[PDB]
Amino acid sequence: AQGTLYIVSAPSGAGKSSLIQALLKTQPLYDTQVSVSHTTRQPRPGEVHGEHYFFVNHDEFKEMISRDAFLEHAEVFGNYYGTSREAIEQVLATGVDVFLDIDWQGAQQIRQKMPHARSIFILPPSKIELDRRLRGRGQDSEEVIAKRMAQAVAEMSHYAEYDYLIVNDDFDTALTDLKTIIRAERLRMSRQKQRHDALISKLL
Amino acid sequence: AQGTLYIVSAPSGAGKSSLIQALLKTQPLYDTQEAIEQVLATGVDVFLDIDWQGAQQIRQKMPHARSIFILPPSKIELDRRLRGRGQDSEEVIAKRMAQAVAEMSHYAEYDYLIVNDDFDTALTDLKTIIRAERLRMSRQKQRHDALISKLLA
Amino acid sequence: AQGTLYIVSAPSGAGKSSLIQALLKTQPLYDTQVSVSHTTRQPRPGEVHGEHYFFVNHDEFKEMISRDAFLEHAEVFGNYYGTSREAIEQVLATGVDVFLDIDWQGAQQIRQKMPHARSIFILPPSKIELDRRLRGRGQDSEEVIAKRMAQAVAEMSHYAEYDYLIVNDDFDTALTDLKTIIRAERLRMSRQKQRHDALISKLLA
Amino acid sequence: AQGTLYIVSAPSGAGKSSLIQALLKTQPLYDTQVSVSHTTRQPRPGEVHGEHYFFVNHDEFKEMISRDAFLEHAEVFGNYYGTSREAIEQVLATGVDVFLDIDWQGAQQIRQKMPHARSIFILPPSKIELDRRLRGRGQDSEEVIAKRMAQAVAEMSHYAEYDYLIVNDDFDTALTDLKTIIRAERLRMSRQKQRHDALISKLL
Amino acid sequence: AQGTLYIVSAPSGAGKSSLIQALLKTQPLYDTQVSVSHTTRQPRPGEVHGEHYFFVNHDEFKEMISRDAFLEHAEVFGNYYGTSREAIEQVLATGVDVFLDIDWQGAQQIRQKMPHARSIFILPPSKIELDRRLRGRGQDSEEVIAKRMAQAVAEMSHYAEYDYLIVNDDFDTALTDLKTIIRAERLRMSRQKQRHDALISKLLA
Amino acid sequence: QGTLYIVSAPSGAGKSSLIQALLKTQPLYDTQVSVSHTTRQPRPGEVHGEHYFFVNHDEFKEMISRDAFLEHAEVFGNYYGTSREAIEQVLATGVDVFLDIDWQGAQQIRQKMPHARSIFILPPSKIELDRRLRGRGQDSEEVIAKRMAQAVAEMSHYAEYDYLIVNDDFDTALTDLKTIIRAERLRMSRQKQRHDALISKLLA
Known part of the structure; x- marks a missing residue:
């Protein structure tokens, strides 16, 4: 009956979007969707x-x-x-479970009006790696890079506000972590009692 | 630092013990026992194999403990699994089937519910719960203390 | 040499076409194709x-x-x-193995002129779930829903006419089932005798 | 209700026994047993x-x-x-599905009195690899090796009598091939009609 | 800092392009790219x-x-x-790791002038299966076929010039083989010391 | 044709359990312990x-x-x-061979066996190493410091090695170890060997 709202936040260079996109390519519309x-x-x-x-x-x-x-x-x-x-x-x-991709600011507004919503934060595996990933193609002025790094540290500050924390070192591992959170939630008593109404009747 | 206590209950013929075993075969002592x-x-995460009685006693003095209940995929399949080798009086079977139904009654008191149809799938479900919990903010903040510092300054 | 024809049927809400599509994205043309x-x-x-x-x-x-x-x-x-x-x-x-996505009608017509063809039927995990899947986006008249649900039951009636039955609960599991069937058939003696002709000579020196 | 009998044959050096042992370590008794x-x-x-x-x-x-x-x-x-x-x-x-480990003689005897039983034959990936495996520890007389190899070829001759054929190159892959056979059989209409009786009612 | 250049060669019929393609669908730009x-x-x-x-x-x-x-x-x-x-x-x-899809000729030119570069060669599982894949759709002249097979054998000749060898029987296995190489190379001490600099400090204080 | 694997790691890296786990899912004609x-x-x-x-x-x-x-x-x-x-x-x-030793024996072996390859396993952080070292949590702080000292001594000859596995998740780490083995088996040298027959037929 009632789907879960997943708020996903991350600094630029954590793969937040690539990850939500990968997850949707292996899951039907009746199960999971993007906001x-x-x-x-x-x-x-x-x-x-x-x-x-x-x-x-x-x-x-x-x-x-x-x-x-x-x-x-x-x-x-x-x-x-x-x-x-x-x-x-x-x-x-x-x-249907819904994935909402937003910044820490939108996050608190939603967590507010949507207290049943769960939240996931993604981090880079090191400072060096985040630098590297931020530098993207490698043709940017050092002043545009420092501004991106600043914005990232600002984002990462609010990490503790979140329910789950994924460290994105290996993309595949991170995608499995995300899939894991989704699946584990669907195993909560609340939803299993729903999904297995018929079976649980026959047994009792 | 702080591990989780997993209360695991199920009627006979759900695979509760075989499942907890299989899980301990591919996991080091510094992680799960x-x-x-x-x-x-x-x-370390602890697995406590018991019945609904113990469960309520432990939910009592261990309010932070999480609880998982395992069910057979159907009544026909439960019957079969309970029959074991198929060499038992039909009256010892019904007493086993009764005890099972009495157990299953308390399933709503639990946090998670696994339906054990395919043993492999059920084993993954169990692992999934374990992994999901370790991804909670409480525990990740602990495990990634050093990294989180480096990122913020 | 000889490939297999796979008749796949299912009521709306079993994932039949999404399943066959997912299967084709991880399988070369010289192995598997859709009709x-x-x-x-x-x-x-x-x-x-x-x-x-x-x-x-x-x-x-x-x-x-x-x-x-x-x-x-x-x-x-x-x-x-x-x-x-x-x-x-x-x-x-x-x-090449061929996937033929149709209803129970074409199925019997094909089972007829292709007696060697195998058939797979996909089912929803429960009536409640079927209902939900059928309701799609949730903006439809109760009368159009009941007409779809009816049409589904009609399709499901012919299920026992099929060789394999997949219950599509978890999409991933259902996809592995579909693959398993495909793989197992290729493990039959008929096709293995063919595919490993060179090797079987050498061992029988 | 009714399980399948799996007649498994192979020459020495195919991994026939290890394989069945591996299969039994990840499957409950109420599903699969050895004879x-x-x-x-x-x-x-x-x-x-x-x-x-x-x-x-x-x-x-x-x-x-x-x-x-x-x-x-x-x-x-x-x-x-x-x-x-x-x-x-x-x-x-x-x-329960049963795994019977025998030679080609036992195979034909059972195929006979158990026409519903299926048979799986495992083969080595090449004669060079077969030689190597048969040599076991590497401390055997060339005339004891030649007798084992002779016995192997004698055993491999009856391969065409079997339903499925597994080429054991990679042990893991061959174990998946074996598992694949088991799972595909369980998906037959005969057994699925049985296992999902309750559900097929409700749907109709 | 330093990515590896992967030189990938194969005859027509090994699925060289499909493999490199499949690999890029499950890997971020900041990890792996095509030429x-x-x-x-x-x-x-x-x-x-x-x-x-x-x-x-x-x-x-x-x-x-x-x-x-x-x-x-x-x-x-x-x-x-x-x-x-x-x-x-x-x-x-x-x-970033780069995949370069070329013939044996370009391979040798690149082994020659390219620093951090490794090479992978892919092969069909048999001659009968190579034949079959080369026949493509099945509508070709036996003389165009012999010309494509001749070109293939010419290509497979240079196989020994290469660091790794993948035999593409089952497509999925072959994709795992490719992934395996990529991963193993990233586990080399050269790159791990790089990637884990901050961690290795803390351990050694 | 085979390969000797030198495996080294400080206490609390999982070195023993890892080599143990690797042997259970692999036949004797492929992999053994030294x-x-x-x-x-x-x-x-x-x-x-x-x-x-x-x-x-x-x-x-x-x-x-x-x-x-x-x-x-x-x-x-x-x-x-x-x-x-x-x-x-x-x-x-x-057969590939696995040699569980310290950095001392390592050099002694790199010496007389220059073709052998070396793998080093590290803990995911100092805090986790500490915790893993503390075993049951019933040891004097001085027996703990002596083991943590012994680890850091062992943990500093790491650059000497070919591969480096960071053992955070046991399962990820075992995949890493398996990956290394597989990738080595995909080397031209050994692939020329195992597929000799096939490579003939192709170049007909």
Whole structure:
């Protein structure tokens, strides 16, 4: 019946997105889905309304802000982004687990209005490795790198606010850790009593 | 530092003991095994094989202990498994089947529930729970103290 | 030399097509392929002839129908849909395993003209779960749901007509079951005698 | 309800015994067992009646041969060895799969009186590898090696009589091949119809 | 700091490209990448510069040829294709492993000038199976087949020049073999000392 | 064709359990443990050949003289050393050999066996090493410091080795050890050997 909301946070260079993406390629829609943000920006090539984003007009957004329709929202680089409340609750009602990819700030807003939500934080395996991963292609000014490293340490500060902690050294290991958390939760008494209603009847 | 106490219950014919065994064969003593609290203080996870009675007594004086209940995949399969070798009086079977049903009644009192159909799958489920708990913030913060420092300054 | 034909049937909500797709992403073309179906309809965005369907004319389709150029066919929602017999026997000749995704009807038609073909039936883990899976996104009329649930029961009735039965609870497990069946068949004497001809000579010196 | 009887044959140097032992270490008794042979020979240290054999006296064995209670029996280096039909039938009745380890002679005898039994033949990956494995510890006379190799080729001749064929190159892969066979058989309509009776009702 | 360059060769029919492809779907960019390769032809739809190819002028390409800016190159169905020395060294400097898919010829040129580089050769499990995979769809002239088989044998000749050897029987096993090599190399003392610098300090205080 | 694996690690790295686990899932014609030579007394169950190569204090002295050992020392009275005859006999049969020793014996063996490869196992952190070293948690702080000192001495000849496994998760670590073995078996040298017959047919 009721799905779980998983809040996933991480600094840039922990593989947070790659990881949530990998997990979805091996799991049906009736089991696990990615949360879909509302945004004001222009769709890019490939992007489709309903899948990558809920693309709406600057006006439609402000209506939604005023009628407290979002669970969290923020302005970024010139456009508005937020996670609809209605969108999340509908999916959960069908018994699907939802992955919400956000920063520590959105996290606390959701943990607030969604106290049943669980939260997972991903970290890099060392400072050196995080540096390396942040440097991406290796063609960036030392001043843009230090600003990215600063932003990362800011993110990582709120790590203790979270329910689970994954250290992402080996990608595969980290993906199994994520899969493990999902599976273990589905073995909680609450949901097993639901999923096995018929069987548990026959035995008793 | 601090380990977890796993209370494991199940009726006969669920595989409770065989399962806890198989799990101890691929896991070092510094990870999984008064006498209870000593081990837990060394950061080891303890598996306590008992019945619903013991369970409630331990849930009592050990409120931080987590509990796992194992069930047969059907009543037909439970019957079969209970019958063991197939050389038993039909009246000793029913007494075994009764005791099992009495056990299964208390399943809702537990934290986790494994349905043991495929033994391999059930063994993974058990491991999964173990791993998931070790990923909790409490325990990871402990185990990664040094790393977390380096990342923040 | 000789490949196998795998008839896969299942009611909506068992994961039948997602399963067959997942299987194809981890298996080369010289080992496993899905049947491709001749259609008379329009190729939408992404859809190409050969890969997605074998898009043909209404006339070209109507010719094929006359000279028995089909393994199964009928009419759905406006157009014409059929599974070509020549296209099957060709791929099977090259030693490839073929997956034929259909309903219980085409199944009996094929079990007929392909008595050597094996059949796999996938089922949901319970009625409650079936209901839920069928309800898809959860924005559908109770009457359209009951019509789907009905159609599913009708399909499920024919289950015992099949060689293997997979209960699709955990998707991953179900996928391994599908693979296990595939692997086990290739372990049969018939095909192993073939595949290891060189080695079996040397040992029997 | 009804389990399968698995006749397993192989030449020395294929890993036939190790394999079956490996399989039994990760499977409960209510699913898979090995067959236990009647014998007239003396139990060694560790060997127990009911586990490693069915140790009987010469006359008891003869009574049996007489009343056709065996599914096979031979005379080796001085003693008798047999497969009680009662012992096998009892276990299959409980729905357990049985693994019977024998030569090609026993195979045909059983194929005969047990037409529903399946047979698996394991082969070495090459004659060079077979030689090597047969040499065991590397301390044997060339005329004892040649007699074992001769015996091996004699055994491998009957390979075509079997249902499945496993090429044991990598031990782990071959063990998966064996496990694969078991699992695929359990997926047959015959046994699945049985195991999921309760569910198939509810669905209809 | 230093990534390894993996030179991968195989005859047609070993699944060399499918293997490298499969490997990249389960591995992050900051761990493993495919070679770019500079070319002169037209950027089709979806095909970005930097990602799919390093597209350039027939002039810019001609300059690069003169000042030995390439690792290998030739002419194919009209245009110019080649992989650049600079493009490889840049990626390996960020600690990424690079997969270069080439023939024995380019292999030798690269063994020659490339520092941290290892080579892997893939082979079919038999001649009958190599035949079958080469026959592809099954609709080819016995003379085009003999020409593809001749080219294959020419390719398999140089197998002994290579560090590792994968026999591609079962595709999944073969992909595990490839993954195994990648992992083992990252367990070498050279790279582990690098990756675990902070940890090794603390242990040695 | 075979390979000798030198495995070293400080106490609390899992070195023994790891080599033990590796042997249970692998046949004798593929992988074995090194049987070392000693002068002391055969305890109950301990068979010459299996557990040790037990020799007279004199036979051991002969063997030290004509440089028959790969490594040796004195321990709590007696003499312990690596029999190079025993090693070479096995490797000749194409079996990989595992040698559990300290950094001292290592160099002695890297010396007379330059083709042998070396693996070093480390604990995931100092805190975890401490905890693992504290075994049951009933030891004097001075017996703990003496073992932690002995570890750090052992843990500093690490660069001398070919491969480095960090044993955090026991299962991950065993996969690492298995990975190394497999990757070595995929070397051209040994693959030319094992697939000789196949490579002929291909180049027809």
